[PDB]
Amino acid sequence: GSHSMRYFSTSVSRPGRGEPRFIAVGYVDDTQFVRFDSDAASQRMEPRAPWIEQEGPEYWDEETGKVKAHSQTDRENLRIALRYYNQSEAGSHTLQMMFGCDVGSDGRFLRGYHQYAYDGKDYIALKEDLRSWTAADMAAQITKRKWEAAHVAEQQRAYLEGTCVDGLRRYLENGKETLQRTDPPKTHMTHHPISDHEATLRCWALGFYPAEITLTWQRDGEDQTQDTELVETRPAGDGTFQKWAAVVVPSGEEQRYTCHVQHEGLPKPLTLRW
C-alpha cells in the first residue's frame, strides 16, 4: 500500500527557566527512526530504529546539521510569535512543526505537508497544491503575506516531491523486513460480571502493526455505538500496538453481541462472539 514520512518538532520557550528546548523526531509510517533533543549532551541526530543505523557518517553529520538549523529557526519564530500576539516575554509557549510526504504503492508522490501550530492551535499550513498557505488567524496572515511575496511554497517543492519521497523510498528498502511487514492482531475476549444482571465484554486486539485498526461492537447485527467504551490505540513498546473495545451487556445476553476487527493484516475481518 501507501507510506508516509513525518518529521515532528516541538520548541518550548522557558523564560525564567533557561533557553528554548527543541525536540524533533522522525517516523516512517508508525515506526520512529531518529530523534534530536536540544538539551541532550550529544547534540546529534540519533538513530531510533535498527535499519537506519546503516547510514554513513556523512548522513548523520548532514542530518544533524539540518535539524540544528531548524531549532535556531523555530527559536526565532518563537520570538516573532510573541510579538505578533503581543504576549509577555515571561510565559512559556510551544511552537510545533510537522512536515513530510506520502507515497503510493509504486513510490510516487501523493501529498506533501508543512504546517505549524502555536500553543496547540493551527498557525500556518501548506495547502495540498504545494502552492498556497492556510493561515489560522490575523497573526498567521502576516506570515502568509510574507511567505507569498517570497515564494516560500514553490521553494519547498523540491524537498517535498523529491528529497522526501527519495528518502522515504530508500527507507522502505533498507527497512523492508520491518517496515513492509504487516502483523495481524492477536484477538481475544474477556468477560467480567458487574452486577447481578450486567456484564462487561471487552474485545482485545494485540500485537498488530501498523497502528490503524477498527473495532466495532454489534448487537444482533446493528452497530452499537454509544454503549461502547473505546481506548486510544496504544503502543506495546516493542513496535506493535494494542487496543480494546468494551460493551456493558445484560447478563445472559452475551451471545447477542459480536465484535468486528478490521486490520490490513487480516485477509477477512474477524468476528468474535463470547
Binding site: 518529521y7 524533533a24 522522525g26 541526530m45 542530518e63 539540518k66 535539524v67 538549523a69 531548524h70 529557526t73 526565532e76 519564530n77 516573532i80 510569535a81 505578533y84 512543526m97 512536515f99 502576516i142 506570515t143 510574507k146 511567505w147 517570497a150 516560500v152 519547498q156 524537498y159 528529497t163 522526501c164 527519495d166 528518502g167
Partner: peptide, 9 residues
C-alpha cells in the same frame, strides 16, 4: 532526510 528550513514568521 530532514529539510533545510530557515523561513521566519
Amino acid at each position: 532526510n530532514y529539510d533545510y528550513w530557515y523561513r521566519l514568521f
